[PDB]
């Protein structure tokens, strides 16, 4: 809890188009993409972990543990598995079976978060923008 919390959003815009074909958006996020739309919040309470996702073409919150694993409906319409682990208390790695099995991994600087995605073949980086 290393005011790891906040607001961020979309803030690099690179290898998009092709990460977004694991992530299972369209059009919808590539535009979002050309701006800052898609965008979380991170709000880690002394009880759970609270996933505000504002990107997946469907803003909407989601509220679990820490290395918890399930799959149910979720984003635009998609149901995939999910888990949300803490590395440390600064990394973020996340875990999704999206298209096959995508990994997220988001580590906080202070001001700002460098992502880092990879799938079976197919591999992002954007660094979001924290306020």
Known sequence: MASIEGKYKLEKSEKFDEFLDKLGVGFMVKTAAKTLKPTFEVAIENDQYIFRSLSTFKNTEAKF??????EEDRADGKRVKTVIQKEGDNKFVQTQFGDKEVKIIREFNGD??????SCDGVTSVRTYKRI
């Open 65 to 70: 543990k820490l290395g918890e694993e399930f």
């Open 112 to 117: 700002e978060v460098v992502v880092t995605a």
